[PDB]
Design a protein around this nucleic acid. Sequence first.
DNA 1: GCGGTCGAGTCTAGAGGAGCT
DNA 2: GCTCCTCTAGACTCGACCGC
Lengths: 959, 368, 353
Amino acid sequence: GQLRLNPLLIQMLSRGLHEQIFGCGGEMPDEAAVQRSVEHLQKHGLWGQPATPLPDVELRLPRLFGGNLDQHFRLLAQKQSLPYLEAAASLLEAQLPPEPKSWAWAEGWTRYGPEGEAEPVAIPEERALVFDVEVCLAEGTCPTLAVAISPSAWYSWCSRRLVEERYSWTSQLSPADLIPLEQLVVGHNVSFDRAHIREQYLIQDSRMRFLDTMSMHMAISGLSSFQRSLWMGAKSWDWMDISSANNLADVHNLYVGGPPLEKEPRELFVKGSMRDIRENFQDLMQYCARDVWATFEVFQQQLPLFLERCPHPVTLAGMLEMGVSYLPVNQNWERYLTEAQNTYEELQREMKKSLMDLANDACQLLSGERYKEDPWLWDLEWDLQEFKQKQEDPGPPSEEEELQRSVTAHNRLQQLRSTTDLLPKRPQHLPGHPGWYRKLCPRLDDPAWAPGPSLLSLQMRVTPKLMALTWDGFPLHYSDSHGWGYLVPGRVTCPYRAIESLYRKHCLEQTYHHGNGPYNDVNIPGCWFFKLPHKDGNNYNVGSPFAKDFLPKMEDGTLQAGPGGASGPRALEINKMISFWRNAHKRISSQMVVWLPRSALPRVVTRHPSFDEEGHYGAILPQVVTAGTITRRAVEPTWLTASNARPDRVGSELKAMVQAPPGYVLVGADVDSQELWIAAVLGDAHFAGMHGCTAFGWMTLQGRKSRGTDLHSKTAATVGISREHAKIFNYGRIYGAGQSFAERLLMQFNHRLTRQEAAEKAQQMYAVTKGLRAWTGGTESEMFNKLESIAMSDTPRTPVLGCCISRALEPSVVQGEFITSRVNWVVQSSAVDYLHLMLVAMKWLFEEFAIDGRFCISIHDEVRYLVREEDRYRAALALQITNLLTRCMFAYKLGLNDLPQSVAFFSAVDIDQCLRKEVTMDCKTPSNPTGMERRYGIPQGEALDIYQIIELTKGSLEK
Amino acid sequence: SEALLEICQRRHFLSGSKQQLSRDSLLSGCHPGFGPLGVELRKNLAAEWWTSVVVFREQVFPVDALHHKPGPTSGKLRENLLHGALEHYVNCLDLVNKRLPYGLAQIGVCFHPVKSIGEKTEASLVWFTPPRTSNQWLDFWLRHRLQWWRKFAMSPSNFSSSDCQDEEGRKGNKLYYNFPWGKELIETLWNLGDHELLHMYPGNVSKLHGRDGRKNVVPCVLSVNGDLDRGMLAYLYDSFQLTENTRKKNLHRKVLKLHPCLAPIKVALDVGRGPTLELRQVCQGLFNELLENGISVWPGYLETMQSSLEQLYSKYDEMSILFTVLVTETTLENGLIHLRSRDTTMKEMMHISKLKDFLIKYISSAKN
Amino acid sequence: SEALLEICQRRHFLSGSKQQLSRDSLLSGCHPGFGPLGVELRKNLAAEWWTSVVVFREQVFPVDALHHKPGPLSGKLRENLLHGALEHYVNCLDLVNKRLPYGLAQIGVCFHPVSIGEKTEASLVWFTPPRTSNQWLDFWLRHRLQWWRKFAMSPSNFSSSDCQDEEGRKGNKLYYNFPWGKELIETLWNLGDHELLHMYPGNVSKLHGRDGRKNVVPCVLSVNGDLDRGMLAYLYDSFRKVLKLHPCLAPIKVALDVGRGPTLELRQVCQGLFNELLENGISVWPGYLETMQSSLEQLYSKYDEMSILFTVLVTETTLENGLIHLRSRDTTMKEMMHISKLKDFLIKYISSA
DNA sequence: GCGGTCGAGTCTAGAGGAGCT
DNA sequence: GCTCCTCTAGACTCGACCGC
Ligand SMILES: Nc1ccn([C@H]2C[C@H](O)[C@@H](COP(=O)(O)OP(=O)(O)OP(=O)(O)O)O2)c(=O)n1
Ligand SMILES: [Ca+2]
Ligand SMILES: [Ca+2]
């Protein structure tokens, strides 16, 4: 009788798991709650809909220590976090001697004993160190000097590139050129200090965990983006006295309150050369030591407070596990960089050639004064500068006559050379070409001259004129007093009739128009000058219609190159195809890659058949901030972002370049609507204590993406907008966005909607989903009521782990302010708690059953693991078990001692050799057109479900 | 497209009568022949191919494959030049001293049955790679060939590509061009195995050993066979800019915008009125000056008759004439000659002594 | 005699087995093929002929004559380049605006039966007005004789003679003096208008010219020179076993090499010099890539047999003072000069000769 | 003695980050 | 719902050469 159910006909967990997790017996459902839930479902027409039951899963979960699964998670976290807190507490009671008199000048670590005496040591022989590393930027990114404090001594490290001035060192980083360090390494932004540690790049996980005072600061006293802007502008302000920015000086001011930190204005590590560092050694070392001591004092005043605000050890263990990220890359990363930069340069050059070709075809409008009819080139300068001079067949020639003719032609030709004296000393520059064309074409005397208008670029004010850009069928126009802006017809004299004809042609092929304003001050004969919508607001003028803000408008078909050619739209598409690399090439090409030598690789990788003696394997340790916002979510711009390979983006397959070494496989899976199900379960727990009691939760559970019954599909059908727009709409409204946010989204996505129409649609969408006013009579009324109640509580804490909100956001300091930020924080920090529970449970499973694998990356809701090849199926089963336990804990902490089967397991545990979103993608891009399977040799990957995992693993994690 | 073939016939890119030319005949290879300007364009295209492939590589070598294929009980005209190149593998292993990778290249004619025998001028490259790096060299050559076909074009997006797999399981690539009617194959890179060499050289296989690094191995044969006749036809279709034909509503000049490294005749040299003898001497001197520096010139000054200047300029534009020099009477006293440019159609009076340097700079700046 | 053919075979001038290549096959177009050096020498000869015949002339144009002739007369391979040229008379008359005289020149293969025999030929047809047929014939004869004697090391071997055909049309034939005997390499014929009238029966209106103001029927002239036989003659002309080919024709001109170690340090310098020379259109033999560096005298002998104008040696000194050995094939005299002066000296040597 | 040009300086606008080097 | 520091690239300007 494994087929269990719910009083709302929702298939719950099977008996085999429900009696091993939540215990036998349970609770008799309250008939009043069942009646209320049934009535609510009947109100929204979701009662009695047939749902196909999933097969019931039978599985033998491992022993649950303590009971209730909450004491189990607590015991796991305590067993994991004990040996590092036992070193943090040792640091907190240190007896550190005064700073050394003179820092030693030698390679390696030198132990500074009592009274500042220098003594060389091989490695710091301690279990706790506060760390701060300085690296010369001129020399590259290899570390230069580092200062670390032990519980009982001071330490210093000087690299070979600061002690010995060799002729030249290699440009490839290796573990033999890094800092030679259970251990705990405290620091400020320790991810930067971690990337310079030698042992952190080996595949085998050395049991070292990093505590980042920046992350603890963001957890304790954090600032939202608007709060950060206000704080920076200034430096109702009660919260300013309790929070600070992420600067080490500001953090030290907030937690210690001593004298302000001294930052060297010379900046010999950022701007100065290596010689400056070699000369100011005794001063730079002292500055680094002062920073280390500031970090030490911050840690002393910060560790107990964080534990008092985040009491559950799961949060601390998850934070310790998020610091150790590891992205294995191979020799294909360099090829990716090279073939992305080359394909970016080629596309940029092709766009430049198209612009030059479109410029050359523009000169011909001068003949007959046809340029006066061109809607785009009418207002340019077309002036021409006057130049300032200041019979029968004779037969075959004889043998000598041909030479005579050649000589008399050559001498006559060379006689004309003597006329160069009359030529002016400084030659005139293209007097016959129009005025606007002389500027573009370089001067002949210039040593870097190139044929044609070689000085043409998108930034110039003529490029949107040559391309004949039309904004919704309206030609662009530039006015000095209002920036850019299109011209709407119907109202050198401008060719208004030509603009009218162009707009008629555009409308046939595909007042009335409302935009940024008619702007009658700029009088273009018979036209209205509507400015381009700027992201900063209608009070600012756009300086370029090719700015990154206009890419969605280009893709939507609003800002399109005009007709009459195939080089305008081609240039526009090339512009759209190289945006990502143009914005991220500096970041992506500057990633620190440390090429492990073969001597440092485990025998699993050095003997696998897929191993070649001519390949290089490295590790891009992400410089993540384990608490990057008020919501404690990790922040790293390069990796932790919603990126995926696209057919029209250059070098966008970077995540596909994180290739596991031969012998290892990146097991991992993505959570299915994590932040939607968290809100749904919160609403269900608040309303009636059963899943699906609210219509929103029922739609989330019994919803099919293909059938269109899900939330996003219904939203898009109701509002008649694209699925991505509806998705952003729903996520924003759930995060706490008001009706004004909906109005601006509707106006931006669809230009045909006025402010009145956008307001009407936003009101109609929010009046049937959230309800009316707390909230009543809506699909998501109970969930929003629960979120507002949690946010408005005296000390808002995450329901599933108890982690407290930031001090700069508690309702005491902020009275009636930042309500949206806190309601968003509820769900987002709940998701962060979900991630921490996942990591703790996964580490417990990998440690108890001896599954050889380590954490790799946690991009958004994805959870990847660099598991060994032989243990891939065991790792997949462990992932399924951890997801089950995490969802059960989420339900248990909210008073629901059950869990629907439809959300009790992963849809598919991806098992591939790269971090592509799906194991079926080939990642075809303009940079990588051939595909992953050909350029590099990466086959596809498995997407096992739970049932397929059980059969392969036999149901037992034990080897 | 109908007007483009009329232009090609009239401006002597394509020979034969008007009724004797159809796109089917051009693609099949049974056309009566290419006009002299078409021959010059094909020579330029072949020279650019040779410069890209054989000149710069330190291993690619030229090979000679006979047109006739003797034996299997009579002879036959060759269909592909790959089998001619594969016979020189052992012969040309001595040149590179049995080092790999090394290749053989050739430009020649290919006879393809259609009841009429057609002809095609195809440039091949048999590239003996070690089997370890077959999928690397194949992709490298795909990128290189696609870049080469795209750099000379006014619209590189038309020169698309595809990845079709052979029936036996071998992988390969087919280049294309988006003609107005459809896509036509112009080059193919097949990653053939060592089957062809083993079949062609039965017996002891120690001959077929290239010293890849330190270990001998039977090389993997890669064939890159492009169609130069259809290539130049594609370039002619691309330069005419049929898609372009709201701004050009009245602006309509029939111009073949061939790349400066491909155009058949670079400059057109004319003359105006009198005196006849001195102007003729100046024109002949300038003609020799330009010719001695590798610049083709159309001798327009020899024309006893004279046409209107606009009609002459249209005639030169249809012939892909980069510049139009006009040596008038005034040149004798100051050395100034009108210089109209095809790209812009704007006259600039440049001193006669500076014309050669400017032309060389303009031609060489486009990778010449 | 035989030694030269052996050297050409070993140095990859004439591809094929030693027994496979025979003198009669060489002279009849039935040889297995041309080696890469032979291919480049043929290309150089074609370029020189194209220059001297079509480039510095405003009356000559290229010809596109197909190989097969799909004529019911069941198609056949072409035996002459003349018929394809005559098929273009009505077409190429408009190019010169019907203004006699004018010419049509082509380089291509002729399928002369022997076993199929193929020879690459450079043929020029000259639509002379009838008045000056003999004059232009003598003009072309003088120019072709001087061109064929220009690159030779001894124009005495190159010769000429007169002859007559069955019809009774004057003509001259060229005969290179091969070591075994006097063999033919070129032939000039003063054909009449019957070659043009047979292809265009009646309606002579389209066949008129513009000699002066009157309209005439041009008297075509046939000038066929076997480029492959020219290659053979020039190879025999050059032949210590050294083939002293003319600089404008030799396939490989520069022999870049290495001397002392380290290999890695000198490899970059050699590759840079190689690219520099190649960008200027000077052929270079990449001899630095040879791992098993042979004796310098043996390498010089190999380059002498390969008709290499100058051999370049890069040693340890080049990394410091930039001195490179530059051996001259003609006078076997070693000399040193700065590595930045090599390109200009090579260009000067090529252009001077 | 006089008028056309050439080049530093200033304003403006989009670009990145809100850390650490 | 928003600030700031800094960097590069483009347009316009004033004031000073210098060719005739
Ligand atoms: N418009 C969106 C979409 C997503 N997210 C956040 C919340 C999610 O927890 C996480 C992952 O959402 P995805 O968009 O990657 O996937 P969805 O959960 O939206 O599923 P689907 O994309 O299939 O609708 O990103 C968000 O803030 N705003
Ligand atoms: Ca730090
Ligand atoms: Ca998801």
